[PDB]
């Protein structure tokens, strides 16, 4: 393998490639599920059997 | 009383196996000396009476199972994380409409998870009792 190492080469390269600021959004997780999900379930298992 | 902090953390009070093994050894020795399973049962029950009485009115199922089967807990368990030789697991559970998170630690994944579930159960009981 070969690659750029010189700082002049480094800064020449960042002209084209960028270090994007990267953040991390999270979300509250909930497990409560609605009845209709149970209904659709039951239907699909009936169909599977 | 445990101090106040930010993260509800817990670990496993390690139980040495030597204690249980030696108790079994004494039972075996008592039997062999007496050669009387009647006398052996007498001593065993004399030892076990409090726990036999207590367990009948409440059977302790596996702690993780207890937490899962609870009606109003609804536990959620994070993935394990390793830092050096400590393994971490965090439990997210709900009590009285307020969602409470507790953290457990252990030498490996299973122990950390069990400690987290145990701590959740302790907090849940403290809210129950």
């Amino acid at each position: 393998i070969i690659t750029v190492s010189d700082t002049k080469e480094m800064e020449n390269v960042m002209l084209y490639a960028t270090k994007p600021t990267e953040v991390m959004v999270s979300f509250p997780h909930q497990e409560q599920v609605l009845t209709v999900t149970r209904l659709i379930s039951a239907e699909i298992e009936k169909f599977y059997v | 009383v445990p101090p106040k902090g930010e993260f509800n953390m817990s670990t496993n009070v390690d139980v040495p196996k030597a204690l249980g093994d030696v108790l079994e050894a004494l039972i075996a020795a008592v039997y062999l000396d007496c050669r009387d399973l009647q006398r052996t049962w007498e001593v065993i029950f004399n030892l076990f009476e409090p726990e036999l009485q207590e367990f009948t009115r409440k059977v302790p199922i596996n702690h993780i199972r207890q937490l899962v089967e609870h009606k109003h807990a609804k536990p959620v368990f994070s993935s394990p994380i390793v830092e050096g030789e400590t393994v971490m697991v965090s439990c997210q559970f709900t009590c009285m409409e307020k969602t409470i998170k507790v953290y457990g630690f252990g030498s490996n994944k299973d122990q950390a998870k069990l400690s987290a579930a145990k701590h959740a159960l302790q907090q849940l009981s403290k809210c129950d009792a």
């Binding site: 393998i1 690659t3 190492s5 084209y16 490639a17 960028t18 994007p20 600021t21 990267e22 953040v23 991390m24 959004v25 999270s26 979300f27 509250p28 997780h29 | 959620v76 368990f77 994070s78 993935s79 394990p80 994380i81 971490m88 965090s90 997210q92």
Partner: protein
């Protein structure tokens, strides 16, 4: 892929996996830096296996 200037990079993660995925991300940073150094500091006269 966020190659543009001042590009923004956003991660959607459930709360209960927040710590784990932070661990994984910083592991990735460590690995990347390790590749960079292993290529930079390394010197070889044969330059061919």
């Amino acid at each position: 892929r966020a190659r543009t200037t001042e590009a923004k990079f956003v991660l959607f993660t459930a709360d209960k996996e927040r710590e784990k995925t932070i661990q994984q991300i910083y592991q990735y940073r460590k690995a990347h830096n390790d590749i960079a150094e292993y290529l930079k500091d390394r010197v070889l006269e044969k330059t061919e296996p």
